[PDB]
Amino acid sequence: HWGYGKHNGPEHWHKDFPIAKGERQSPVDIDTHTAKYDPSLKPLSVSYDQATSLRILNNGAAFNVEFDDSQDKAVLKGGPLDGTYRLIQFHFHWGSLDGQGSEHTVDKKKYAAELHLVHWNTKYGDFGKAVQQPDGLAVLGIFLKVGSAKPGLQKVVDVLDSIKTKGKSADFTNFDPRGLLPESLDYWTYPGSLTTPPLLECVTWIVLKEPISVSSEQVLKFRKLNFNGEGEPEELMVDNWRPAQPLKNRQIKASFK
Numbered sequence: 001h002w003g004y005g006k007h008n009g010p011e012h013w014h015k016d017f018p019i020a021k022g023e024r025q026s027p028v029d030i031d032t033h034t035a036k037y038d039p040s041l042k043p044l045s046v047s048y049d050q051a052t053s054l055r056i057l058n059n060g061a062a063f064n065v066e067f068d069d070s071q072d073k074a075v076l077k078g079g080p081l082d083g084t085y086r087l088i089q090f091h092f093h094w095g096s097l098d099g100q101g102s103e104h105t106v107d108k109k110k111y112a113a114e115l116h117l118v119h120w121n122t123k124y125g126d127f128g129k130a131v132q133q134p135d136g137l138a139v140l141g142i143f144l145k146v147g148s149a150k151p152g153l154q155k156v157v158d159v160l161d162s163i164k165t166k167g168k169s170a171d172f173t174n175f176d177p178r179g180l181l182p183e184s185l186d187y188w189t190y191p192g193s194l195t196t197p198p199l200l201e202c203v204t205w206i207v208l209k210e211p212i213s214v215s216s217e218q219v220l221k222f223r224k225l226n227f228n229g230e231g232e233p234e235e236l237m238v239d240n241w242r243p244a245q246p247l248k249n250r251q252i253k254a255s256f257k
């Protein structure tokens with residue numbers, strides 16, 4: 001099955017998922033000089049005050065913090081979006097070393113990690129129907145650099161020991177994702193895809209310009225997770241990022257000058 005090893009990594013995914021070579025694949029390099037300011041773009045509206053986290057799961061590709069999405073509790077609206085998108089989960093991608101780990105890049109710069117807050121368009125009723133639509137998902141991407149600790153991340157870091165291996169989960173209630181946001185909500189946006197199989201071309205990407213800072217110790221703990229299941233040879237969950245894909249016939253728009 002697909003993964004991030006030498007034998008099953010991103011360069012192999014097209015054999016099972018031919019859309020991997022499609023016209024609107026993610027992630028991409030964000031060339032800052034070519035992204036054009038679009039004065040028609042609105043401020044992003046991030047409404048997470050009533051977010052209800054439930055569980056954290058190691059799915060063998062990353063860890064997901066899952067939310068109750070049975071009602072409009074934590075929603076993303078505005079920005080480039082038409083309509084209301086409900087938060088279902090967040091997860092990260094990260095590297096074996098601080099100099100790599102992000103999926104998007106900025107003028108070819110790789111950050112240490114990248115947070116994806118995944119939201120689905122409520123007009124399609126459920127996540128499964130949403131991923132079949134070109135405007136079905138909105139993913140808020142936030143870069144992580146290593147420096148000062150991010151206090152609002154520590155609760156996530158501290159539970160990781162309990163979900164070391166694929167298939168493990170732990171209760172994870174009352175987590176406030178507002179603690180993972182940077183100060184500014186300035187962003188780039190473009191149409192793209194899921195960055196893991198099935199690689200569906202159903203995502204409006206919104207990537208924040210301002211990275212958050214996390215400490216070396218925080219990200220070191222990410223790197224102690226495992227891709228493997230319990231009792232299997234240990235494969236550290238590191239370098240779980242898909243590299244940048246061709247931009248093709250797309251324009252990246254900036255919300256800021």
Ligand SMILES: [Zn+2]
Nearest residue numbers: 092093116195
């Ligand atoms: Zn992701």
